[PDB]
Design brief:
4 copies of one chain form a homotetramer. Chain A folds into 2 domains: 297 residues, 3-Layer(aba) Sandwich (Rossmann fold), CATH 3.40.50.1480; 162 residues, NAD(P)-binding Rossmann-like Domain (Rossmann fold), CATH 3.40.50.720. Helices cover 42% and strands 14% of the residues of chain A. Chain A is built from 20 helices and 17 strands. Chain A has an 8-stranded mixed β-sheet, covered by helices on one side. A 7-stranded parallel β-sheet of chain A has the order 3-2-1-6-7-8-17, with helices on both faces. In chain A, strands 4-5 form a two-stranded antiparallel sheet. In chain A, helix 2 packs parallel to helix 18 and helix 6 packs across helix 7. At the B-C interface, helix 11, helix 12, helix 15, strand 11 and helix 20 of B face helix 10, helix 11, helix 14, strand 11 and helix 19 of C. The structure holds nicotinamide-adenine-dinucleotide (NAD) (2 copies). One nicotinamide-adenine-dinucleotide (NAD) sits at the interface of chains B and C. It is classed as hydrolase. The entry lists the keywords S-adenosylhomocysteinase, Neplanocin-A, NAD, Structural Genomics, Center for Structural Genomics of Infectious Diseases, csgid, hydrolase. It forms a tetrameric assembly.
């Protein structure tokens, strides 16, 4: 037994949930039906760092049926669905390092173990994955920081001091994620100081699932420091305009209904950030009678919010009157402890963005004399000692739809994961320096949509030759120019 | 040892702190109940009243019980559904000695009727702890009221021939059909009580001052009794208060239907053809919520007025038979029975979801589905079962065994609307108690009190109410303080 | 010959609209088909005071095909559709005294003429109508004030001084409508002081269309001054829950679109009054992106607004911030000159209630130093002298959906007018010092709904005997108890 | 050089609406404030072909205040607002050739005159514009076809026979628009065969307002036949995501309420095309209770429609049951004569796309034995002689919001038109061979949004340095990458 999971006996519930889920994941069902025998990913070692849900287990199953060997971990300490994880282990579909309620330390150990492969020749030698499926950039981060650490290690033939200290370049305390990651890097430098650089040779790419992960990729790219090809799956139209928006419209409500006992109707609920995710959040909240107040830094998004009937305000002007706060920025320090101190009694705070630092959870937990009580497994009420007023935080500020619920439903995830399988296949067939972040073709993007039309009984109109020539498109697409915004 | 802890029958007393914490959080929005406790906890208008409740024991209900308790009443409680009890809510009441409780999540139908009977059984410490009944009843669906009346009928039959009437000892009804399990289990209790004391039910009537009924289905049962001249005690209809029916039934379900569906049905609602059978107060809310998350709602209705209302909101109105093969999810919201038959179920597409939000499980023919020759059943997750027909090999997925899905698969309506319903309940209980000092009929609370309920909740939401000038008040012919609408106003 | 309209040449444009409108007015089509042979209203003299729109023409046609003789006028100086009035006169369906943009003086003269019938036996003598169709209660008001005036006239053998003065009580100037009505009453007393009382024996009742008219009836009943039977048509479920709400949802917008050039999306629109009309107005405004703010006196209605996501405030707390103000209360002095002076530049003010005194128009027009410029017909900008700021009034405060637009569409008016025909037939069929106000039975209310199901392709489900017994109703209905609110 | 409009006495009504409109057009108001002294467009001859509405008059005034000489015409025969055209002529800020209800021949004559300028040196000699503001691409089309005509004329020393023929290649009858354009071009070849080619020299560019015009530009570019620089205004975020969507949401409803007497609630309304325009149309229709059914060729757009709860079907499966049909495709022959013959009695047909050929109006009008009645101004009922069934067409299939109503409101037009002015200034500045189509920068696109925030009381949030660096943007924008879809 190499996998490290919660409980293998939950396998059958997972397997059963996978089959029910699969009814609507027609994109993944079709890729399996079309490629299970030809196996286009045969020989590929794939490491995944992505919320291990039932939907994800179907993604993993799909990659496995296309011939890949798979190792997997979750990209969040609270998102793993333990029955989903056990289904993959029992069936020998993948080697898994993930469980619900991981410590930060265990998060980084699991990611590192998922990145570790034993060479098919001899078990003595370690090697890396050929491909990476990433959500948030953590697997991509540990690889680049691993390489940087090794280069610093050789340069002075000793452990770089930045890995043996609790402080950053400016004397401040390092985040728990960096301390735990640096601890893993130091350990690996002593076991093998060419571990990370040795992987670069066999690494053919990474396919990134989400906006926060993409931003990280784009930053590396513009600095000329990206060390492998990358496909941006987030910005496929069938991902960003469906998963991000429609997926959150349902999964935000599910997370809120599970964690927040109150009625949303008539409540002033602040949605911080009105991008693809924020738009979905507001639509769902209004659907159940909430009066949505939006905050934005972008004047275009602000205007869009206003066109849908929502008030647009700065947090300071509403922090004392609003009832519920939802961060959807992908930024950091959007809700501070100071903001929290001004909120009304039993105001709720939740985050749906990828990382928990949108909310100053650290400042809240380390506030002098603060009291905390567990409302439920993942809901905590914090009471400030000076005012005696309390705020209620959902799942310690981690993405609420996956921390307090089961994330987006199968339909949109099938669309997102169909893009993932296609991105992986593209990277694999192109396998062989300035590396780029590219997106999938519009042809494939439309194809993903075509694969899901029958789920919903959608009947598509077909162009005539005359109409096609008139609007200047092929009868079979693509139907829009590259800059079309949908 | 504590009498409340020992006498109560719940699942786990250790969950009490979670219950108490939830109750405190809920109180932020349950301003109606918070105010009644503040205003009356000293003078205790319900002092000495023995109240028996039969209403889903949720956190919201625990605050209701706490309110009756702070007003001076002794209390015993049970839920009105085998799956709706929230064990932490029940534990909270037992640990604080607020009430003697007989309720847990996932009861059997036998246990359900034994808990109700026990909730109706009191002892008088001033009369050598001898058996008696409650003074007041809080009912949701009319089961407390049913056992009382069937209890009186049973005793009247028993007394004629000095023996147990044979309709209690038989597993079949008047038409030779197999009795529902609820009737069998209720008759079993009635038979046992006739042997303990054949003057038990009629003996309670002396001290019973009324029942206050929470929902549409329980009210229907009351009106049927009243029109037949068989209602044995005064009743207050709480469901038809404006601050109950226009809020709990509609806006409560808008949220709680979705929560139940999200927990039981893993699939995305967006784009699905979802049938909502019944477009009354509950259906209106279900529809609004469903389309709020992208579903395409199709309505079935028997009332041409309601059907037209659905159509005005952009919904297709169809007969079930015309969409039973194409629709993805079916939600019954009628309060009727046999709305979705086994025969309808056999025609549904593969993996169609079926759920009910009405009070009783018989809206969907669950019994006929479970007892269909050769049917195959597997438990997907908690209270979610897939049934497979042997002749077609097609499957349908039933949520909560047909039981009201918002309470059985989720936590029911949220605190805010429940406070509005429960403020009406406390007012009704007080009205019946102060009144203690053809024959019996059903009545509703006055509009003054109905408007009062709403006033108590305006600050929760930062609502600012405009005030009429004398000139305006005289012009529209109302008092500055209300009521602001005539009795027939529909809101 | 005896009709007074603007132009009879428009008739053809009215007759075409009537036929098109009849596609959706199935209730009226059905009553015509079913009762035109037997003619249940045969010999009845019907006077109508109801906005003479295309829809009203179909109502009047239906009363005519059913054997009635008819005289009609509009219940508002701006609501008449000239092509509709022409159609009725051209085909000799009714005698009409109505045109768009009447003066208030002519309004009362037109009404008084509509009430004046000639005795079929001896036409040299006057008589009144047998039945009245009323909207707002003006026909009912002139009858009752006329009777009061005649009685007062006899006690002192002279014109009562209240009819000749023009202040009354507080010394405040009397409304133009009362002065013009009193002028007509004075003129009729001098010609025949038994005119009004002479109509009482043969008057079999009035059927009242709207909330404001019903309110006036209820006041008369509580004081024991109601002089004839009345049917409250507004409170049929198929009128109040459809016309008041869904009719306004479309016609308000249409009225706002013709008079207000500005975009509604993003604007803070205050809807004063959240009753059957207010609910519909809000729904329509939200539908095109406006942020609706509600004002209410009734806490129940205020809570309903909150449950639909609308902020509920008092006018004084938003009068300076809001962009548009829509009164829908059926009350008076809701928007005062003092409120208007605090409004922002080019703020729009409109009314959808029956009467124009919801907004203090008289006070605005007669403000010292006020400047007024007509932007277009029925749209005026008023500029205050001190601040130099302006407000824009639609329709001189008259119901904006009928004054600036064509009112509710055919479908809902058919439901309302099907109730009217049924009411007229009930009062005629039934032909005592005390008279009361009653409503149609729920059987007939449900019948109105049944007649319109085929329009929209609605398929109704039918109860089995065991279900009908279980829910305690008859298979053919009624399906709800009398206190059911729908 | 003397204007041709309907009636100059309407001037004050236009000038009055202009000032009221300016309240929301803060983009154009700002450009006037900032650049009226320096006049960056001084000396520039600007010819515009764009619906001459009140909104357009503020655009022309802005262009004038920036120093340009201006001559203008509408891009549709029914969209001109005569009072708007009058205001421009009265204020003498532009030479105008436009009026409501033009003939097709007049349209091309007006456009050709708008393209004709008297040489800055001589009064006898003719020249062309320096810049073109176009909507639909007709100004751009006449120029390119004018050049082709001249080149073909010199090639064989004769009038090209395609200009004289009434049919074209496939034997089908040429559209009236083509026959009229060709007649104008034929005549210009005789007066001066180097007219069009003479213009290319002084033409610095065209700025195209809409999707259909852009498509035409992209086709010419791909073929390497574009003869001047071009700026695609349609695809600025502040145009396509506001004008096309939220503009139509209000203006479609305005057009339908004016042309269609029926209630939209409950009706099955088919929206053909679910792009930027269709999205808005559907939302506005749903908002008034309609049951929207969508037709699409694009599987992504079709899925999006399904995610909003709309049924997605092919026209043939609903053509007999639907009540109202709205084309929003920018394609042609979307609704054929055969489809119209299958529609139910009194079905309504309207188009909101740029050209009238989305619906086969020509075929309908010229159908053998077709009866047609004018229901009202710009609304016609057509009855087929075989079935005796009727269909009702709004403004002869021309864009319904501008034909049956007053187009989009000022707010969105200011956003669209602020982009036009910015583009014209860009083209004019660059004057100091393959031509391409470019779009404005995201800096300017966001700037357009900023200019309109105060209208709606929008409070923008400002990024901190730490936040700015974390998400890798400047504190002052741009805040999104180029491919961001909003
Ligand atoms: N789950 C909850 O929390 C909750 C909340 C409130 C009420 N309820 C229950 O919900 C049920 C409905 O309550 P309501 O207040 O909406 O009652 P209602 O009378 O307002 O609505 C029921 C509707 O069902 C329609 N109907 C009846 N039989 C039908 C059939 N065979 N097909 C189609 N339509 C049919 C009726 O015309 C009616 O409009 C009741 O059982 C009530 O006790 C449950
Ligand atoms: N324009 C139309 O086509 C049309 C259609 C139907 C009714 N009406 C008219 O519209 C008016 C309202 O009709 P309704 O059916 O909605 O009546 P309603 O009683 O249902 O609604 C009126 C609401 O206004 C509120 N109100 C009263 N005074 C107020 C004040 N000073 N400030 C704030 N709120 C106040 C009341 O609480 C009430 O809820 C009446 O005059 C009626 O005749 C017009």
């Amino acid at each position: 037994m190499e996998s490290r999971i919660k409980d293998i006996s939950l396998a059958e519930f997972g397997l059963q949930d996978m089959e029910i889920a699969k009814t609507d994941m027609m994109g993944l069902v079709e890729l399996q039906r079309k490629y299970r025998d030809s196996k286009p990913l045969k020989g590929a070692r794939i490491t995944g760092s992505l919320h291990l849900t039932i939907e994800t287990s179907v993604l993993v199953e799909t990659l496995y049926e296309l011939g890949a060997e798979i190792r997997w971990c979750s990209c969040n300490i609270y998102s793993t669905q333990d029955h989903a994880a056990a289904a993959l282990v029992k069936k020998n579909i993948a080697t898994v390092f993930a469980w619900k309620n991981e410590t930060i330390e265990d998060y980084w150990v699991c990611l590192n173990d998922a990145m570790t492969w034993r060479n098919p020749n001899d078990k003595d030698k370690i090697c890396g994955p050929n491909l990476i499926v990433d959500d948030g950039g953590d697997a991509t981060l540990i690889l680049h920081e691993g390489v940087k650490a090794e280069i610093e290690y050789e340069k002075y033939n000793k452990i770089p001091e930045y890995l043996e200290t609790e402080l950053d370049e400016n004397g401040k305390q390092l985040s728990m994620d960096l301390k735990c990651m640096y601890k893993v890097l130091k350990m690996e430098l002593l076991k093998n100081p060419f571990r990370w650089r040795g992987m670069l040779k066999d690494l053919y790419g990474v396919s990134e699932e989400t906006t926060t992960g993409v931003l990280r990729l784009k930053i590396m790219e513009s600095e000329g420091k990206l060390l492998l090809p990358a496909i941006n799956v987030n910005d496929s139209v069938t991902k960003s305009k469906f998963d991000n928006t429609y997926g959150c419209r349902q999964s935000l409500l599910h997370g809120l209904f599970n964690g927040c006992i109150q009625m949303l109707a008539g409540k002033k609920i602040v949605v911080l950030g009105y991008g693809e995710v924020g738009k979905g959040c507001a639509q769902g909240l209004s659907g159940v009678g909430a009066r949505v107040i939006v905050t934005e830094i972008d004047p275009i998004c602000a205007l869009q919010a206003s066109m849908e009937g929502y008030q647009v305000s700065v947090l300071e002007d509403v922090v004392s009157e609003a009832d519920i706060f939802i961060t959807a920025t992908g930024n950091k320090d959007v809700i501070t402890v100071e903001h929290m101190r001004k909120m009304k009694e039993n105001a709720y705070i939740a985050n749906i963005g990828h990382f928990d630092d949108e909310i100053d959870v650290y400042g809240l937990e380390n506030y002098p004399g603060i009291k905390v009580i567990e409302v439920k497994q993942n809901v905590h009420k914090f009471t400030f000692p000076d005012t005696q007023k309390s705020v209620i935080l959902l799942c310690k500020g981690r993405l609420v739809n996956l921390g307090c619920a089961t994330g987006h439903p199968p339909l949109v995830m099938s669309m997102s994961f169909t893009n993932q399988v296609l991105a992986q296949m593209d990277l694999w067939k192109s396998r062989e320096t300035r590396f780029f972040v590219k997106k999938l073709s519009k042809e494939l993007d439309e194809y993903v949509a075509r694969l899901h039309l029958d789920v919903l009984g959608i009947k598509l109109t077909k162009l005539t030759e005359t109409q096609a020539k008139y609007i200047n498109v092929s009868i079979n697409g693509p139907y829009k120019s590259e800059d079309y915004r949908y």
